[PDB]
């Protein structure tokens, strides 16, 4: 029996449902996982630290969960000191942090390749400051290297109570340079609000262009900008044409809404799919430990999280070295890792919006 810890934000209903589906689906014979679910906040680092020390008091071998941009350094510090691996579907970090395994591939390089394929020089970039500032620095460095005209504007500093005149003033100021082209980099809720306000002010006719910079391009509502005329591009990680993905959707849409909240959909969010893939990755790694006959068994006496000096236990160092030795096939396609913890040998589809719906035009990898 392997005891692990699980942290989930207050509001993550579909992700915990896909986690339950992955735990039922990937049950093995040699052992059994036991997640300790902590449904606390994600922005308040005090509650995150409390849940971290509560999971560390149980003596767990791995910790799964999300993190906010205001708590990324807290997670990397607390997981690098105590040498405990942390598997996450959240946004990638800026650096090679030990014991941090990530499920989201790079979005910056795919976006730069998409701009270099579309042969652009002047556009606007409406971003959000909740997943770091990595892509912003990347596109500003590429604009300095390629002599572009990027109008980079944050949108995350606007409240939900007066977001009608601020967006009107923003898209009125974007008409000063006559910007025919805007790249949107927002979360799954802000994209829908910006698209609804654009439809309200009427800026989705043929003559403009949009790019939804996320992995879940089909997660938003695209029936409202389907008949507009402005061709909209985006990136997709969950290819629905695969047999395993189609079987997972056929087993997903037939589920009960009351038994699994947010599961009676024809699609699925990308974070839920990365959670379902991370369950498979952890199951394959623990099965490789059960097959290599490595005894790391202990009890729930790991001590307090604030020990001075907090002494590590060396058998966890192999566990991250086990996690880098995992190359499987899941809803994100191929899963292969480096020595740091990033994802290698991945494939992201580039979706363009047609009249009949979303249509794929090609794929992108890091080796090509």
């Amino acid at each position, epitope marked *: 029996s392997i005891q692990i810890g699980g942290l989930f934000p207050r509001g993550a209903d579909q992700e915990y449902s896909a986690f339950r589906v992955g735990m*039922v*689906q990937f049950s093995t014979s040699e052992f*059994r996982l036991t997640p300790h679910i902590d449904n606390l906040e994600v922005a308040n680092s005090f509650a995150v630290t409390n849940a971290f020390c509560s999971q560390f008091s149980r003596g767990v071998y791995a910790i799964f969960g999300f993190y906010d941009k205001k708590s990324v350094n807290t997670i990397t510090s607390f997981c690098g000191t105590l040498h405990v691996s942390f598997i996450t579907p959240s946004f990638p970090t800026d650096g090679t942090h030990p014991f941090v395994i990530q499920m989201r591939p790079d979005l910056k390089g795919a976006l730069l390749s998409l701009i270099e394929y579309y042969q652009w020089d002047k556009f606007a970039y409406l971003y959000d400051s909740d997943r770091g500032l990595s892509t912003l620095q990347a596109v500003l460095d590429s604009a300095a290297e390629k002599k572009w005209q990027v109008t980079a504007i944050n949108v995350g500093n606007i409240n939900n109570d007066k977001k009608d005149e601020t967006y009107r003033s923003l898209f009125q100021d974007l008409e000063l340079k006559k910007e025919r082209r805007v790249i949107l980099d927002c979360e799954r809720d802000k994209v829908n609000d910006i698209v609804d306000q654009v439809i309200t002010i009427g800026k989705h006719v043929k003559g403009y262009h949009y790019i939804i910079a996320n992995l879940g391009f089909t997660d938003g509502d695209l029936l409202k900008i389907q008949f507009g005329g402005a061709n909209v591009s985006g990136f997709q990680i969950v290819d629905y044409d695969d047999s395993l993905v189609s079987k997972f959707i056929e087993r997903w849409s*037939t*589920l009960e809404e009351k038994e699994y909240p947010g599961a009676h959909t024809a699609t699925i969010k990308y974070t839920s799919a990365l959670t379902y893939d991370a369950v498979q990755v952890m199951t394959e790694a623990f099965r490789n430990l059960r097959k290599q006959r490595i005894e790391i068994s202990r009890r*729930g006496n790991a001590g307090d999280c604030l020990a001075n000096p907090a002494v590590p236990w060396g058998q966890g160092v192999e566990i991250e070295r086990a996690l880098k030795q995992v190359q499987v096939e899941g809803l994100s396609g191929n899963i292969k890792f480096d020595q740091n913890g990033k994802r290698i040998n991945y494939t992201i589809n580039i979706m363009e919006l047609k009249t009949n719906g979303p249509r794929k035009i090609g794929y992108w990898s890091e080796v090509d």
Partner: antibody
Amino acid sequence: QAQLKESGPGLVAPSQSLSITCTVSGFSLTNYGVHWVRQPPGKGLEWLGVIWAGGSTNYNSALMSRVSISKDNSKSQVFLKMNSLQTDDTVMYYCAREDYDYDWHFDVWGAGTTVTVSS
Amino acid sequence: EIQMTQTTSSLSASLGDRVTISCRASQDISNYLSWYQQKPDGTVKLLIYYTSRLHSGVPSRFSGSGSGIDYSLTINNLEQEDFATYFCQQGNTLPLTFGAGTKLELKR
């Protein structure tokens, strides 16, 4: 509502086979797992084995070479096969459904059938 | 393996009593235990999951508490449909050994 019903032959000879049929209704057997357990009269209930929704199956360590499980999702039936029966097999058999609700829990169980092994 | 035990074998209560049923284990299970009810015909259903929450379909009259190795189920008011066998099930390590089980009884 979900209901499970266990049935068997009841009277079986020693050192023979035993096929128990568990019929479940009110839910689907493609996304949940099944668990078969025994119950001795006057003693503690012991878990015989379990099968998952994805085809994975496990059993107890003492009689892993004596129990097998098959399933039919069209009839929502679970067939448990038990061989090498002895005189101490006059017990009850129950079948339950498993779920993840922050712990591996048994939600919907059955009535259980009485099997008496005698010659 | 992990041996589960229950001292109370037959409990006596009336209609409307807050009855408690305790359970102990061989070690700490970190509240990964469930409480289930089984009628006299043999049909068993779940009552309380993860030792503190209630499942969808059970009433709000039952609850649970406890920590470490000592858990407990609690009923605020006993009903006619509440006359059943209560069993505790641990889910820490394989094989999942269930509890001994207690049987409620009406006082007259």
